[PDB]
Chain length 105, copies 2
């Protein structure tokens, strides 16, 4: 298991490597065997999509009393948590773990 | 709708009426046209089972931030809520409603 948490994979999802192809600028009309150092300055943009399918493991508990669950504070506040501000900046207020339900040993 | 809350039914679940059959005590060996007033004092006990099937209506919300949910207090206490005491007496600490999720108008 990875010590920062997560899924240890011998074959992880692969690296996806991307690069702008070099478009050279105006070459000299005489030949030079040196490599090109002058390129057209360019960048690229676009959209990227990732679609992961997850397999769930459902609770099968016979516990009587209710369990501790992650809830939002339903009191008045200036900013709603996990939303944007007045300046349009998204923020995350706290780290949300994943151990809220209970199982016996 | 019933004003104490619930399901208005023109044909509700029917009344289930139960009664111990009168077993008379020792009658006189001469006939008397009066009704019996002396019975063997008896009671009955047993088990009763009710099995209601409910139809659920699942949430289909596109809400981003988390919703208010009924949780148990996960702090230290003398008695766990909705359990028995040291004397074995079950209690309910508070009324639990049913409106915790949200839908738009």
């Amino acid at each position: 298991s990875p010590l920062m948490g997560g899924f240890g994979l011998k074959h992880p999802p692969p690296q996806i490597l991307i690069k702008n192809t070099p478009v050279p600028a105006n070459p000299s009309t005489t030949f030079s065997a040196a490599k090109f150092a002058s390129f057209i300055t360019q960048y690229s943009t676009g959209q990227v999509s990732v679609e992961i399918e997850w397999e769930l493991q459902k609770e099968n508990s016979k516990r009587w009393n209710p369990e501790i669950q992650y809830t939002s504070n339903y009191n008045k506040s200036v900013n709603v948590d996990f939303t944007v501000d007045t300046n349009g900046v998204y923020s995350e207020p706290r780290p949300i773990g994943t151990r809220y339900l209970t199982r016996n040993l």
